[PDB]
């Protein structure tokens with residue numbers, strides 16, 4: 016009867032409960048024990064973006080890239096490999112220009128020309144965004160109130176944290192990721208697989224990531240011989 | 241040629257046609273014959289939320305919970321089990337605090353701190369939302385015009401009805417569901433499975449639902465012995 | 466170690482790379498060699514919608530349908546088969562009224578009563594939208610700036626192009642599609658399959674498409690005997 020169905024539903028809920036729990040546990044285990052070889056530090060990227068946040072965001076883009084190439088030669092994609100690629104993740108739509116990416120880090124220019132918002136993603140990685148233009152509203156888990164951030168500010172998305180993010184038209188930022196970068200690909204590609212069906216954008220995304228990986232491998236081989 | 245491909249496509253469309261049709265028919269059969277044991281009634285929840293809609297929505301939250309505990313003891317989750325959990329469904333992102341849930345009913349606090357909107361879901365359940373703060377725009381199926389609702393109003397999402405819903409930042413409401421509650425889980429979890437990949441939020445969602453079910457089972461056992 | 470994992474990840478990225486690439490290649494092959502039997506032309510639909518863009522969009526709807534029936538008898542669905550059906554695709558939510566659809570073309574009334582936006586879709590089809598009311602913001606791939614279009618304007622979504630689209634509440638338009646129409650169904654239904662779970666809307670969508678196909682088949686049989 017009604018009690019039997021309640022018990023069976025509770026059994027199935029406990030089944031999904033322990034599956035999701037152990038999946039989170041494995042995410043924590045893979046992440047905490049993951050490698051931590053760091054070329055950059057988030058304060059370095061944040062100060063460099065905050066210095067040029069008063070410029071037109073495209074002029075800021077160029078000066079940030081030139082400085083990143085001067086201070087970290089061999090770790091930034093050349094001009095021929097820079098490309099604006101749409102990003103559809105967690106219900107929002109923006110675009111990116113990948114500058115650096117490895118197993119443990121990534122650096123990219125991010126933003127949107129449309130009003131958008133959605134889920135931030137939850138992963139074992141520390142993501143930081145320094146706003147060059149526009150507005151960035153963040154709604155943290157466990158709260159009923161959100162906060163808006165402006166050019167010059169830096170939002171630090173902590174490891175294991177989940178937020179709601181919302182950007183206005185013409186918002187652009189410099190983004191630095193640190194942690195277990197591969198564990199973020201599922202979030203980055205989900206809306207392409209199950210919503211947009213934009214397989215050429217998927218092609219673009221894995222192409223620039225593979226190029227960034229090959230750049231790091233080529234530089235690591237040259238630093239040893 | 242062109243006529244052959246048109247016929248084959250029409251055959252496949254009829255295939256998807258009869259599959260979706262019989263799936264809807266089974267949804268109607270399971271729902272109409274589902275159980276209907278009711279602890280609350282929607283007018284009770286709506287009047288209680290409308291009375292406190294003039295307060296700060298968090299003060300309203302507390303007074304509504306206290307009143308629901310006084311009038312329905314044994315059917316509201318204790319303070320230790322209350323938690324704000326993100327809800328990603330039908331393209332929108334809000335958050336909930338589950339107070340009561342069974343096979344046939346649920347009562348929760350709902351809202352969002354970001355501008356969001358999307359599909360309401362179509363299921364065999366009668367959902368009603370009494371706005372405490374913010375704005376609630378509803379766009380009904382079969383019409384080209386939408387309506388906006390304000391604090392004190394109650395939107396009644398009818399059984400089998402589908403709407404587009406849109407909430408502004410800082411909109412909060414009291415929500416009561418009545419019907420075949422399990423048939424709504426697929427809509428509630430879809431964007432977590434196929435977009436956000438937020439498995440810890442999924443863990444949170446099934447945990448509070450299982451706790452609410454266990455509360456109802458514990459109370460039903462005590463009312464008999 | 467770290468180099469081994471980098472190589473393995475690069476191998477898997479190249480795997481996804483060549484899969485998505487050949488899927489795009491097959492999309493191009495099917496599309497370029499697809500049939501091109503055309504009842505309408507986009508300038509015809511655009512001028513007819515632009516003439517009536519100064520009217521109330523519902524009065525414009527009726528006059529456009531009457532004119533399309535007068536100039537293309539046997540290719541427009543009768544009043545009994547006209548229906549507003551929700552469209553959930555690429556993260557946005559609108560609604561449509563299908564007037565004509567074949568293997569190579571389609572004509573429909575489109576719009577939304579809510580603020581929405583998302584991915585446009587990428588397919589081998591040329592889509593054109595003439596705005597009757599509201600605002601249409603388009604963000605093209607490879608750019609950091611978007612453009613807004615107004616009643617009387619026509620946006621032409623080119624073959625293979627991907628954009629971000631965003632519409633304000635009360636935006637309505639006349640839409641004409643030309644190309645390999647079946648290759649667009651996956652984009653049109655994805656958010657229904659993996660987000661909204663609205664199987665009755667899916668039932669509605671394949672019903673009107675099958676009816677439009679059957680209309681074209683019936684007219685083609687009568688034009689020969």
Ligand SMILES: C[C@]12CC[C@H](OS(=O)(=O)O)CC1=CC[C@@H]1[C@@H]2CC[C@]2(C)C(=O)CC[C@@H]12
Pocket residue numbers: 102104111113116121123125134135136142144172180190192196199200202203224
């Ligand atoms: C998916 C994510 C991380 C989460 C960001 O969301 S955000 O709101 O915190 O900015 C968006 C974002 C944009 C670019 C994504 C990045 C994750 C790592 C990705 C997939 C690569 O290896 C190449 C491009 C990278």
Ligand SMILES: C[C@]12CC[C@H](OS(=O)(=O)O)CC1=CC[C@@H]1[C@@H]2CC[C@]2(C)C(=O)CC[C@@H]12
Pocket residue numbers: 327329336338341346348350359360361367369397405415417421424425427428449
């Ligand atoms: C999924 C749904 C019902 C549809 C609501 O959408 S709404 O626009 O009508 O408010 C959102 C909503 C929020 C909480 C959801 C509820 C359905 C039943 C759920 C999944 C439980 O057992 C626990 C939490 C409940």
Ligand SMILES: C[C@]12CC[C@H](OS(=O)(=O)O)CC1=CC[C@@H]1[C@@H]2CC[C@]2(C)C(=O)CC[C@@H]12
Pocket residue numbers: 552554561563566571573575584585586592594622630640642646649650652653674
């Ligand atoms: C999916 C798409 C094409 C892309 C449009 O997006 S848009 O931003 O370019 O307007 C939305 C749109 C609406 C109606 C869709 C159409 C594609 C072809 C569809 C599925 C049919 O056979 C029947 C209804 C048609």
